[PDB]
RNA sequence: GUUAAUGUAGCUUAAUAAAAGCAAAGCACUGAAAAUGCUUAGAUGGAAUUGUCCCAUAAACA
């Protein structure tokens, strides 16, 4: 089950707010990540 | 009849938490499966953005156990890697002295 | 090696307490010194 | 003037007690037993008993530990045993449920420290 | 005694299935606490980035709806794994079977499994064999034939000649079971997931 | 500071997640048992047919690893 | 129908004087794991008596 480990909470000792963005891959696949800045999407070249 | 060597697993992911969260998760599965884990090391950030990589040590494996284990690892993944591997304390040496004396 | 090792003191304490009650050949300190009702319970 | 075991210096728990109140937390049930030096349980309170569990929502709970403490105290008070020695382990002492159960004994009048033997 | 070897081809799902509502609420909970433990026109740039995601074609989570009846096509399923299943026609009995090719004692089981792909798959896509132990042996007699059911996972999916005249169907678990009518074949699903 | 109702709502969804996860653990544990039993059953099947083949098969492949799969 | 299986909850030859113990899960925690605290889940589909029938189920024969 891929979602078994995907869903987790940040247990790090303090951190800056991370905003959700998608790293769009060249094959059309997408992956959710938490990024420091309030961006929306990222593109892999 | 030959037995597998100790194979380290390098888990590199975009998010430090996700890499570690998978690294701890596999250890839990490893412990349930009776897989010995010597250490869970973390590598430095790949400064250029950065990436986070964690080593999960695995020791002991069998032909049938290998087949099922890696299949489970593939499904469990939400970048996998499998590779063969490459200060003692006072009580440890004291026993060591007697053997060689 | 194969046998598990106690990770908590309590489980060993239960094992230790159980052994004390159990008889041993060597001298030890101790030697010297209906159905329908059950269904009703499930409903409750 | 009754005797107490004054030895077992190297072994814990200490045997210096006329009565010892041992509370055992199982996977699903928590039970409290008062036993004499011989080890016979004079008075026993267990959540597994039908009457308590019918009136008790969840066999294992902090309040369940509180409830059994009060129930055991009443059994102890009616029995006539008012003083016992309880020696929880450091983590067991830290447990809130044991603290809550101990609080029930204090408010119920049960004392967890027995007096020293008089010569 | 006739010698026959079967290869149980396996393909991993490309994309994960959607999260259940109980998973979604937990995702909200971890996000909500994530903000709690966090330490502190951009919208126009954000709008430019979000639309850039839309213009680029994304990989569909499930291609079954689009493919529907494209069983011969390699990527029958994206949510779940695929098992290659190829009709084997014989005079004594003609039944839908798993990819099968003869096996010789001199050739090791893995080598036999490789020949099955080299003799039937005949396509760029590559599979890897983990354990030399077989995953199943099932014998059907009429003449007695024993079939060795090896297993294979797909490294790559560069299928060649998607529309082979040969009746090759990729079925995850359910469509596979229906085809495997004989109980010997039906039991082949014991190790299949 | 979160209100008691807010904690109640978060606690409520926590119960649902815990209940499902335990169900998954039983299902996942049973799945491994079925996977292992089938694989172990497959081991015994060819042993009856021909044990000699296994002597070579049971030996591990040194060249199998390092092997990385996503 | 013949052979053969399978029938307290992952495990137990726990139990017929009272349906138990253990394993297992999650959360808090922070190196990891474990521990600790807070919590979660379940069965006799079953009659024998010790410390085989039985019907059901599902297989080779059929």
Coordinates of C-alpha atoms (C1' of nucleotides) in Angstrom, one line a residue:
Chain A
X1 CA 0.0 0.0 0.0
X2 CA 1.6 3.2 -1.2
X3 CA -0.6 5.4 0.9
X4 CA 0.4 3.4 4.0
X5 CA 3.6 5.5 4.3
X6 CA 2.6 8.5 2.3
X7 CA 0.2 9.9 4.9
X8 CA 2.3 11.1 7.8
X9 CA 2.7 14.2 10.1
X10 CA 5.7 16.4 10.6
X11 CA 7.3 15.5 13.9
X12 CA 10.3 17.8 13.4
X13 CA 11.3 20.0 16.3
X14 CA 10.0 23.3 14.9
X15 CA 10.0 24.5 11.3
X16 CA 8.7 27.2 9.0
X17 CA 5.3 26.8 7.3
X18 CA 5.3 24.5 4.3
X19 CA 2.8 25.1 1.5
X20 CA 1.5 22.3 -0.8
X21 CA 2.9 22.2 -4.4
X22 CA 3.0 19.7 -7.2
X23 CA 6.3 18.7 -8.8
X24 CA 5.0 18.0 -12.4
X25 CA 7.2 15.4 -14.1
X26 CA 7.8 15.3 -17.9
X27 CA 5.8 12.0 -18.2
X28 CA 2.7 13.6 -16.7
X29 CA 3.0 12.1 -13.2
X30 CA 2.6 14.4 -10.2
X31 CA 3.7 14.2 -6.6
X32 CA 2.6 16.3 -3.6
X33 CA 5.2 18.0 -1.6
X34 CA 5.4 20.7 1.2
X35 CA 7.4 23.7 0.2
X36 CA 8.7 26.6 2.2
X37 CA 7.3 29.3 -0.1
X38 CA 3.6 29.8 -1.1
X39 CA 4.1 28.4 -4.6
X40 CA 1.7 26.2 -6.5
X41 CA 3.6 23.9 -8.9
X42 CA 7.1 22.8 -9.9
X43 CA 8.3 21.5 -13.2
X44 CA 11.0 18.9 -13.8
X45 CA 13.0 19.6 -16.9
Chain B
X1 CA 23.1 -23.3 0.3
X2 CA 24.4 -19.7 0.6
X3 CA 23.1 -16.8 2.7
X4 CA 22.7 -13.2 1.6
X5 CA 25.0 -10.5 2.8
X6 CA 24.0 -7.4 4.7
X7 CA 22.5 -5.0 2.2
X8 CA 22.0 -1.3 2.9
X9 CA 18.9 0.6 1.6
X10 CA 19.3 4.2 0.6
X11 CA 16.0 6.1 0.8
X12 CA 16.1 9.4 -0.9
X13 CA 13.0 11.6 -1.1
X14 CA 12.1 15.2 -1.8
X15 CA 10.8 15.7 1.8
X16 CA 13.1 15.0 4.8
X17 CA 10.1 13.8 6.8
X18 CA 8.8 11.5 4.1
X19 CA 12.2 9.9 3.6
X20 CA 12.5 9.4 7.4
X21 CA 8.9 8.4 7.7
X22 CA 9.4 5.6 5.1
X23 CA 12.8 4.8 6.7
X24 CA 11.1 4.3 10.1
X25 CA 8.2 2.5 8.5
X26 CA 10.4 -0.1 6.8
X27 CA 12.2 -0.7 10.1
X28 CA 8.8 -1.4 11.7
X29 CA 8.0 -3.9 9.0
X30 CA 11.6 -5.2 9.2
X31 CA 11.1 -5.7 13.0
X32 CA 7.8 -7.5 12.4
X33 CA 9.4 -9.6 9.7
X34 CA 12.3 -10.4 12.1
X35 CA 14.7 -8.4 9.9
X36 CA 17.7 -7.1 11.9
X37 CA 18.5 -3.4 11.4
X38 CA 21.9 -2.3 12.7
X39 CA 21.5 1.4 12.2
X40 CA 19.4 4.1 10.5
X41 CA 21.8 6.7 9.2
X42 CA 21.0 10.0 7.6
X43 CA 23.1 11.7 4.8
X44 CA 23.8 15.4 4.4
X45 CA 21.5 17.6 2.3
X46 CA 22.5 17.6 -1.4
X47 CA 23.1 21.3 -1.7
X48 CA 23.2 22.6 -5.3
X49 CA 17.6 22.9 -4.0
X50 CA 18.4 20.0 -1.7
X51 CA 17.4 16.3 -1.2
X52 CA 17.3 14.2 1.9
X53 CA 18.6 10.6 2.0
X54 CA 18.4 8.0 4.8
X55 CA 20.2 4.6 5.1
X56 CA 18.2 1.7 6.6
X57 CA 20.6 -1.1 7.4
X58 CA 19.3 -4.6 6.6
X59 CA 21.2 -7.8 7.7
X60 CA 20.1 -11.3 6.9
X61 CA 18.0 -12.5 4.0
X62 CA 16.9 -15.6 2.2
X63 CA 15.9 -16.5 -1.4
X64 CA 12.2 -16.9 -0.6
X65 CA 12.4 -14.1 2.0
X66 CA 14.1 -11.8 -0.5
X67 CA 11.3 -12.3 -3.1
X68 CA 8.5 -11.5 -0.7
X69 CA 10.3 -8.7 1.1
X70 CA 11.2 -6.5 -1.9
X71 CA 7.7 -7.0 -3.4
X72 CA 6.3 -5.7 -0.1
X73 CA 8.8 -2.8 -0.2
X74 CA 7.7 -1.9 -3.7
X75 CA 4.0 -1.7 -2.7
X76 CA 4.9 0.1 0.6
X77 CA 6.7 2.8 -1.2
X78 CA 4.6 6.0 -1.4
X79 CA 13.2 6.3 -4.5
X80 CA 14.2 2.8 -3.3
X81 CA 17.7 1.4 -3.3
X82 CA 19.2 -1.9 -2.4
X83 CA 23.0 -2.4 -2.3
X84 CA 25.5 -4.6 -0.6
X85 CA 27.2 -3.0 2.3
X86 CA 30.5 -1.2 1.3
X87 CA 34.4 2.8 19.1
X88 CA 34.2 -0.2 21.3
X89 CA 33.4 0.0 25.0
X90 CA 35.3 -1.1 28.1
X91 CA 33.5 -4.4 28.6
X92 CA 33.9 -5.4 24.9
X93 CA 37.7 -5.2 24.9
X94 CA 38.1 -6.9 28.3
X95 CA 36.4 -10.0 27.0
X96 CA 38.4 -9.5 23.8
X97 CA 41.7 -9.6 25.7
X98 CA 41.1 -13.0 27.2
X99 CA 40.4 -14.7 23.9
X100 CA 43.7 -13.6 22.3
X101 CA 45.8 -14.0 25.4
Chain C
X1 CA 19.6 -15.6 20.3
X2 CA 16.4 -16.6 18.5
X3 CA 14.3 -16.2 21.7
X4 CA 13.1 -12.7 22.3
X5 CA 14.6 -10.6 25.1
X6 CA 12.5 -8.7 27.6
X7 CA 12.1 -5.1 26.5
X8 CA 10.0 -4.2 29.5
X9 CA 10.7 -5.0 33.1
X10 CA 7.0 -5.8 33.8
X11 CA 6.8 -8.8 31.5
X12 CA 9.9 -10.3 33.2
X13 CA 8.3 -9.5 36.6
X14 CA 5.2 -11.5 35.5
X15 CA 7.5 -14.3 34.4
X16 CA 9.5 -14.1 37.7
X17 CA 6.3 -14.0 39.8
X18 CA 4.9 -17.0 37.8
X19 CA 8.1 -19.0 38.4
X20 CA 8.0 -18.4 42.2
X21 CA 4.5 -20.0 42.5
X22 CA 5.6 -22.9 40.3
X23 CA 7.2 -25.8 42.2
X24 CA 10.9 -26.5 41.9
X25 CA 12.9 -29.5 42.9
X26 CA 15.5 -27.4 44.7
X27 CA 14.4 -26.0 48.1
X28 CA 12.6 -22.7 47.8
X29 CA 11.4 -20.0 50.2
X30 CA 7.8 -21.1 50.0
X31 CA 8.5 -24.6 51.1
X32 CA 10.5 -23.5 54.2
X33 CA 8.1 -20.6 55.1
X34 CA -25.5 -20.4 32.6
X35 CA -25.1 -20.1 28.9
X36 CA -28.3 -18.0 28.6
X37 CA -27.0 -15.7 31.4
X38 CA -23.8 -15.2 29.4
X39 CA -25.8 -14.2 26.3
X40 CA -27.6 -11.6 28.5
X41 CA -24.2 -10.2 29.5
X42 CA -23.3 -9.8 25.8
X43 CA -26.6 -7.9 25.1
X44 CA -25.9 -5.6 28.0
Chain D
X1 CA 3.7 -6.4 67.4
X2 CA 3.3 -8.8 64.5
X3 CA 6.5 -9.7 62.7
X4 CA 7.6 -8.2 59.4
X5 CA 10.2 -9.5 56.9
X6 CA 13.1 -7.2 57.6
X7 CA 15.6 -8.7 55.1
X8 CA 15.7 -8.9 51.3
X9 CA 18.1 -5.9 51.2
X10 CA 19.3 -6.7 47.7
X11 CA 15.9 -7.7 46.3
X12 CA 13.0 -5.5 45.4
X13 CA 10.1 -5.2 46.1
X14 CA 10.8 -4.9 49.9
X15 CA 9.1 -7.6 52.0
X16 CA 8.5 -5.2 54.9
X17 CA 4.7 -5.3 54.8
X18 CA 1.9 -7.1 56.7
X19 CA -0.3 -6.6 53.6
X20 CA 0.6 -5.6 50.1
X21 CA -1.9 -4.2 47.6
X22 CA -0.8 -5.4 44.1
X23 CA -2.6 -4.0 41.0
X24 CA -2.1 -5.9 37.8
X25 CA -3.0 -4.2 34.4
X26 CA -3.7 -6.8 31.8
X27 CA -4.3 -6.3 28.0
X28 CA -8.0 -5.9 28.5
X29 CA -8.6 -5.9 32.3
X30 CA -7.2 -4.3 35.4
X31 CA -7.4 -6.0 38.7
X32 CA -6.3 -5.1 42.3
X33 CA -5.5 -7.7 44.9
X34 CA -4.6 -7.4 48.6
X35 CA -2.4 -10.2 49.9
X36 CA -0.8 -11.2 53.2
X37 CA 2.8 -12.3 53.7
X38 CA 1.7 -15.8 52.8
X39 CA 0.5 -14.4 49.5
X40 CA -3.2 -15.5 49.9
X41 CA -5.4 -12.7 48.5
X42 CA -7.7 -11.8 51.4
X43 CA -9.8 -9.4 49.4
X44 CA -9.8 -9.2 45.6
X45 CA -11.3 -6.6 43.2
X46 CA -11.3 -7.4 39.5
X47 CA -13.1 -5.8 36.6
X48 CA -13.6 -9.3 35.0
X49 CA -16.3 -9.9 37.6
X50 CA -19.7 -9.7 36.1
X51 CA -21.3 -7.3 38.5
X52 CA -18.6 -4.6 38.0
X53 CA -18.3 -5.0 34.3
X54 CA -22.0 -4.8 33.7
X55 CA -21.9 -1.4 35.4
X56 CA -18.5 -0.5 33.9
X57 CA -18.4 0.8 30.3
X58 CA -14.9 -0.1 29.3
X59 CA -12.9 -2.8 31.2
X60 CA -9.6 -1.0 30.7
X61 CA -9.7 2.8 31.5
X62 CA -8.3 5.3 33.9
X63 CA -11.8 5.7 35.4
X64 CA -12.0 2.0 35.5
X65 CA -8.8 2.0 37.7
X66 CA -10.5 4.7 39.8
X67 CA -13.7 2.6 40.0
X68 CA -12.0 -0.6 41.1
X69 CA -10.0 1.4 43.7
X70 CA -13.1 2.7 45.3
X71 CA -14.7 -0.8 45.0
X72 CA -11.7 -2.5 46.5
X73 CA -11.6 0.1 49.3
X74 CA -15.1 -0.6 50.3
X75 CA -14.3 -4.3 50.3
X76 CA -11.2 -3.5 52.4
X77 CA -13.1 -1.2 54.7
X78 CA -15.8 -3.8 55.4
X79 CA -13.2 -6.5 55.7
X80 CA -11.5 -4.5 58.4
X81 CA -8.1 -4.1 56.7
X82 CA -7.4 -0.3 56.7
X83 CA -3.6 -0.2 56.2
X84 CA -1.5 -1.7 53.4
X85 CA 1.8 -1.1 51.7
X86 CA 1.9 -0.5 47.9
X87 CA 5.3 -0.1 46.2
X88 CA 4.7 0.8 42.5
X89 CA 7.6 0.9 40.1
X90 CA 8.9 4.3 39.0
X91 CA 6.9 4.2 35.8
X92 CA 4.0 2.6 37.5
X93 CA 4.1 5.4 40.1
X94 CA 4.2 7.9 37.2
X95 CA 1.0 6.4 35.7
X96 CA -1.9 8.7 36.1
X97 CA -4.3 5.7 36.6
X98 CA -2.3 4.4 39.5
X99 CA -2.2 7.9 40.9
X100 CA -6.0 8.2 40.4
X101 CA -6.5 4.7 42.0
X102 CA -4.3 5.7 44.9
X103 CA -6.3 8.9 45.3
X104 CA -9.4 6.7 45.6
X105 CA -7.7 4.8 48.5
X106 CA -6.8 8.0 50.3
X107 CA -10.2 9.6 50.0
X108 CA -11.8 6.3 50.8
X109 CA -9.7 6.2 54.0
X110 CA -7.3 3.4 52.9
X111 CA -3.8 4.2 53.9
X112 CA -0.9 3.0 51.7
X113 CA 1.7 3.4 54.5
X114 CA 1.6 0.9 57.4
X115 CA 3.1 1.7 60.8
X116 CA 6.4 0.3 61.8
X117 CA 6.5 -2.7 64.2
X118 CA 6.8 -1.8 67.9
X119 CA 9.1 -3.8 70.2
Chain E
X1 CA 6.0 -37.3 -19.2
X2 CA 5.5 -34.0 -21.0
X3 CA 7.5 -31.0 -19.7
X4 CA 5.9 -27.6 -19.7
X5 CA 6.8 -24.4 -17.9
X6 CA 4.6 -21.4 -17.1
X7 CA 5.7 -17.8 -16.4
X8 CA 3.5 -15.6 -14.1
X9 CA 4.2 -12.1 -15.4
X10 CA 3.6 -9.2 -13.0
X11 CA 3.4 -5.5 -13.6
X12 CA 3.3 -2.9 -10.8
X13 CA 0.5 -0.3 -10.8
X14 CA 1.6 3.0 -12.2
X15 CA -0.4 5.3 -9.8
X16 CA -1.9 4.9 -6.4
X17 CA -5.6 4.7 -5.8
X18 CA -7.5 7.7 -4.3
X19 CA -7.5 8.1 -0.5
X20 CA -10.5 7.0 1.5
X21 CA -12.5 9.7 3.4
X22 CA -11.0 8.4 6.7
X23 CA -7.6 8.8 5.0
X24 CA -8.6 12.3 3.9
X25 CA -9.7 13.5 7.4
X26 CA -6.4 12.2 8.8
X27 CA -4.6 14.1 6.1
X28 CA -6.5 17.2 7.3
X29 CA -5.5 16.4 10.9
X30 CA -1.8 16.1 10.1
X31 CA -2.0 19.3 8.0
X32 CA -3.9 21.1 10.8
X33 CA -1.3 20.2 13.4
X34 CA 1.4 20.9 10.8
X35 CA 0.2 24.5 10.8
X36 CA 0.1 24.5 14.6
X37 CA 3.8 23.6 14.9
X38 CA 4.9 25.7 11.9
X39 CA 6.7 29.0 12.3
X40 CA 4.9 31.7 10.3
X41 CA 0.5 40.0 -6.3
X42 CA 1.7 36.5 -5.4
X43 CA -1.7 35.2 -6.5
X44 CA -1.1 36.2 -10.1
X45 CA 2.2 34.2 -10.1
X46 CA 0.3 31.4 -8.3
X47 CA -2.4 31.5 -11.0
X48 CA 0.3 31.3 -13.7
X49 CA 1.8 28.2 -12.0
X50 CA -1.5 26.4 -11.3
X51 CA -2.7 26.8 -14.9
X52 CA 0.7 25.5 -16.1
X53 CA -0.2 22.3 -14.4
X54 CA -3.5 22.1 -16.3
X55 CA -2.0 22.7 -19.7
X56 CA 0.5 19.8 -19.2
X57 CA -1.2 16.5 -19.8
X58 CA -1.1 14.4 -16.5
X59 CA -1.0 10.7 -16.3
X60 CA -4.5 9.4 -15.5
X61 CA -4.8 7.5 -12.3
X62 CA -7.0 4.8 -13.9
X63 CA -6.9 4.0 -17.6
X64 CA -9.5 1.2 -17.3
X65 CA -12.4 3.6 -18.2
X66 CA -10.6 4.8 -21.3
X67 CA -9.2 1.4 -22.3
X68 CA -12.4 -0.5 -21.2
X69 CA -11.8 -3.6 -23.5
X70 CA -8.2 -3.0 -24.5
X71 CA -7.1 -6.2 -22.7
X72 CA -4.4 -6.9 -25.3
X73 CA -2.9 -3.5 -24.5
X74 CA -0.1 -3.7 -22.0
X75 CA -1.3 -1.0 -19.6
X76 CA -4.7 -2.5 -18.9
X77 CA -4.6 -1.4 -15.3
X78 CA -2.9 1.6 -13.6
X79 CA -4.4 1.3 -10.1
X80 CA -3.6 -2.4 -9.7
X81 CA -1.1 -4.9 -10.9
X82 CA -1.4 -6.9 -14.1
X83 CA -0.9 -10.6 -14.9
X84 CA -0.1 -11.6 -18.5
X85 CA -2.5 -14.4 -19.5
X86 CA -2.1 -16.0 -23.0
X87 CA -4.4 -18.6 -24.6
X88 CA -2.6 -21.9 -25.2
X89 CA -4.5 -24.2 -27.7
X90 CA -3.8 -27.9 -27.8
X91 CA -5.6 -30.8 -29.5
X92 CA -6.3 -32.8 -26.3
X93 CA -7.5 -29.7 -24.4
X94 CA -7.9 -26.1 -25.6
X95 CA -8.1 -23.7 -22.6
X96 CA -7.0 -20.2 -21.7
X97 CA -3.7 -20.6 -19.8
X98 CA -0.8 -18.6 -18.4
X99 CA 2.2 -17.9 -20.7
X100 CA 3.8 -21.4 -21.1
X101 CA 6.8 -22.8 -22.9
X102 CA 8.6 -26.1 -22.6
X103 CA 11.2 -26.6 -19.9
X104 CA 14.3 -28.8 -20.0
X105 CA 16.2 -30.2 -17.0
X106 CA 19.5 -28.9 -18.4
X107 CA 18.1 -25.4 -18.4
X108 CA 17.6 -23.9 -15.0
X109 CA 14.2 -22.6 -13.9
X110 CA 15.1 -19.0 -14.4
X111 CA 16.6 -19.7 -17.8
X112 CA 13.3 -21.5 -18.7
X113 CA 11.4 -18.5 -17.5
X114 CA 13.6 -16.2 -19.6
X115 CA 12.8 -18.3 -22.7
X116 CA 9.1 -18.0 -22.1
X117 CA 9.4 -14.2 -22.5
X118 CA 11.9 -14.6 -25.4
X119 CA 9.6 -17.1 -27.1
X120 CA 6.1 -15.6 -26.3
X121 CA 6.5 -12.0 -25.1
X122 CA 9.0 -11.0 -27.9
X123 CA 9.0 -7.4 -26.9
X124 CA 11.3 -4.7 -25.5
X125 CA 9.6 -4.6 -22.1
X126 CA 11.8 -6.4 -19.5
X127 CA 11.0 -8.6 -16.5
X128 CA 13.1 -9.6 -13.5
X129 CA 13.2 -12.9 -11.7
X130 CA 13.9 -12.8 -8.0
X131 CA 13.8 -16.3 -6.6
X132 CA 14.7 -19.5 -8.4
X133 CA 12.0 -21.3 -6.4
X134 CA 8.8 -21.9 -8.4
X135 CA 5.6 -20.2 -7.4
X136 CA 3.4 -23.1 -8.3
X137 CA 3.2 -26.5 -10.0
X138 CA -0.1 -27.8 -11.5
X139 CA -0.7 -30.9 -13.5
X140 CA -3.6 -31.6 -15.8
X141 CA -4.0 -35.1 -17.3
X142 CA -6.1 -36.5 -20.1
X143 CA -1.5 -38.0 -21.3
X144 CA -0.2 -36.2 -18.2
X145 CA 1.1 -32.6 -18.4
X146 CA 2.8 -30.8 -15.5
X147 CA 3.1 -27.0 -15.7
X148 CA 5.7 -25.0 -13.7
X149 CA 4.3 -21.6 -12.7
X150 CA 7.2 -19.3 -12.3
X151 CA 6.7 -15.6 -11.5
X152 CA 8.0 -12.4 -13.2
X153 CA 7.8 -8.7 -12.4
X154 CA 7.9 -6.1 -15.2
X155 CA 11.0 -3.8 -15.1
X156 CA 9.7 -1.8 -18.1
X157 CA 6.6 -1.6 -20.1
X158 CA 7.8 -1.1 -23.7
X159 CA 5.4 -3.6 -25.2
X160 CA 5.8 -4.4 -28.9
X161 CA 2.9 -5.5 -31.1
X162 CA 0.2 -4.6 -28.6
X163 CA -2.4 -6.2 -30.9
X164 CA -0.9 -9.7 -31.3
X165 CA -3.2 -12.1 -33.1
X166 CA -2.4 -14.4 -30.2
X167 CA -5.0 -14.1 -27.4
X168 CA -2.9 -12.3 -24.8
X169 CA -4.9 -10.6 -22.0
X170 CA -3.6 -8.8 -19.0
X171 CA -5.8 -9.4 -15.9
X172 CA -5.0 -8.2 -12.4
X173 CA -6.9 -10.8 -10.3
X174 CA -10.6 -10.9 -11.3
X175 CA -10.6 -11.2 -15.0
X176 CA -7.7 -13.7 -14.6
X177 CA -9.8 -16.0 -12.3
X178 CA -12.7 -16.2 -14.8
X179 CA -10.4 -17.4 -17.6
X180 CA -8.6 -20.0 -15.4
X181 CA -11.6 -22.3 -15.6
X182 CA -9.9 -25.6 -14.6
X183 CA -9.4 -25.9 -10.8
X184 CA -5.7 -26.6 -11.3
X185 CA -5.4 -23.2 -13.1
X186 CA -7.9 -21.6 -10.6
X187 CA -5.5 -22.6 -7.8
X188 CA -2.8 -20.6 -9.6
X189 CA -4.3 -17.5 -8.0
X190 CA -3.3 -18.6 -4.5
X191 CA 0.0 -16.8 -4.8
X192 CA -1.5 -14.0 -7.0
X193 CA -2.5 -10.8 -5.2
Chain F
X1 CA -6.0 27.5 22.1
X2 CA -8.3 24.8 20.8
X3 CA -11.8 24.6 22.2
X4 CA -13.0 21.3 23.8
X5 CA -15.4 20.9 20.8
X6 CA -12.5 21.3 18.4
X7 CA -10.5 18.6 20.3
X8 CA -13.7 16.5 20.3
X9 CA -14.0 16.7 16.5
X10 CA -10.3 15.9 16.0
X11 CA -10.5 13.1 18.5
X12 CA -13.6 11.7 16.7
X13 CA -11.8 11.4 13.4
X14 CA -8.8 10.0 15.2
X15 CA -10.9 7.1 16.3
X16 CA -12.0 6.4 12.8
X17 CA -8.4 6.4 11.6
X18 CA -7.3 4.1 14.4
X19 CA -10.1 1.6 13.7
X20 CA -9.3 1.5 10.0
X21 CA -5.5 1.1 10.5
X22 CA -6.0 -1.9 12.8
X23 CA -8.3 -3.4 10.2
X24 CA -5.6 -2.8 7.6
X25 CA -3.0 -4.4 9.9
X26 CA -5.0 -7.5 10.2
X27 CA -5.7 -7.6 6.4
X28 CA -2.0 -6.8 5.7
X29 CA -0.9 -9.4 8.1
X30 CA -3.2 -12.0 6.6
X31 CA -2.1 -11.0 3.1
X32 CA 1.5 -11.7 4.1
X33 CA 0.5 -15.0 5.6
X34 CA -1.3 -15.9 2.3
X35 CA 1.7 -14.7 0.3
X36 CA 4.1 -16.7 2.5
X37 CA 1.9 -19.8 2.7
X38 CA 1.5 -19.9 -1.1
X39 CA 5.2 -19.3 -1.6
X40 CA 6.0 -21.9 1.0
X41 CA 3.4 -24.2 -0.5
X42 CA 5.0 -23.7 -3.9
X43 CA 8.3 -24.8 -2.3
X44 CA 6.9 -28.1 -1.2
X45 CA 5.1 -28.8 -4.5
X46 CA 8.2 -29.2 -6.6
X47 CA 10.0 -31.1 -3.8
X48 CA 7.6 -34.0 -4.3
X49 CA 8.1 -33.7 -8.1
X50 CA 11.9 -33.4 -8.1
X51 CA 14.0 -32.4 -5.0
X52 CA 17.2 -32.3 -7.1
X53 CA 16.1 -29.2 -9.0
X54 CA 15.7 -27.3 -5.7
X55 CA 19.3 -27.9 -4.7
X56 CA 20.4 -25.5 -7.4
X57 CA 17.3 -23.3 -7.0
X58 CA 17.6 -22.7 -3.3
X59 CA 21.0 -21.2 -3.7
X60 CA 21.0 -17.4 -3.8
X61 CA 21.9 -15.3 -6.9
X62 CA 24.9 -13.1 -6.0
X63 CA 24.3 -11.0 -9.1
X64 CA 20.6 -10.3 -8.2
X65 CA 21.6 -7.3 -6.1
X66 CA 22.3 -4.4 -6.2
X67 CA 18.7 -4.0 -7.6
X68 CA 16.6 -0.9 -7.3
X69 CA 13.0 -0.7 -8.3
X70 CA 10.4 2.0 -7.8
Chain G
rG1 C1' -20.5 -40.8 -2.4
rU2 C1' -15.0 -42.9 -1.8
rU3 C1' -10.0 -40.6 0.1
rA4 C1' -8.7 -36.3 2.2
rA5 C1' -8.9 -32.2 4.6
rU6 C1' -11.1 -27.9 8.7
rG7 C1' -14.3 -26.3 12.9
rU8 C1' -12.3 -21.1 20.3
rA9 C1' -9.5 -14.2 18.0
rG10 C1' -2.5 -14.0 15.1
rC11 C1' -1.0 -18.0 19.1
rU12 C1' -2.3 -21.7 23.3
rU13 C1' -3.3 -29.1 24.9
rA14 C1' -6.6 -21.3 28.5
rA15 C1' -11.4 -23.3 30.4
rU16 C1' -15.5 -26.4 31.3
rA17 C1' -14.7 -25.7 38.8
rA18 C1' -14.8 -19.2 34.5
rA19 C1' -15.1 -17.6 27.7
rA20 C1' -8.7 -16.4 29.9
rG21 C1' -3.4 -15.1 28.9
rC22 C1' 0.0 -13.7 25.2
rA23 C1' 1.0 -11.7 20.6
rA24 C1' -0.7 -7.4 17.7
rA25 C1' -2.5 -1.8 16.5
rG26 C1' -2.8 3.5 17.1
rC27 C1' -1.6 8.0 19.7
rA28 C1' 2.0 11.2 23.2
rC29 C1' 7.0 11.2 23.2
rU30 C1' 11.4 12.5 19.5
rG31 C1' 17.8 10.5 17.4
rA32 C1' 15.7 5.4 15.1
rA33 C1' 13.9 1.3 17.7
rA34 C1' 12.4 0.1 22.4
rA35 C1' 10.4 1.6 27.0
rU36 C1' 6.7 4.5 29.3
rG37 C1' 1.5 6.9 29.4
rC38 C1' -3.3 7.3 26.9
rU39 C1' -6.2 4.1 24.0
rU40 C1' -8.3 -0.1 19.8
rA41 C1' -10.0 -5.0 18.1
rG42 C1' -11.9 -9.3 18.0
rA43 C1' -14.0 -16.0 18.7
rU44 C1' -16.3 -21.5 20.8
rG45 C1' -20.3 -22.0 13.0
rG46 C1' -19.1 -27.6 17.0
rA47 C1' -20.2 -32.8 20.3
rA48 C1' -17.9 -35.5 23.0
rU49 C1' -12.7 -37.3 27.4
rU50 C1' -8.1 -36.7 28.4
rG51 C1' -3.1 -33.7 29.8
rU52 C1' -13.5 -40.0 17.5
rC53 C1' -17.8 -39.1 15.7
rC54 C1' -20.5 -34.4 14.2
rC55 C1' -22.8 -31.7 10.4
rA56 C1' -21.0 -27.8 7.9
rU57 C1' -17.2 -26.3 4.6
rA58 C1' -13.7 -27.5 0.5
rA59 C1' -10.3 -30.5 -2.3
rA60 C1' -8.0 -35.6 -5.1
rC61 C1' -11.1 -40.0 -6.4
rA62 C1' -15.6 -38.0 -8.0

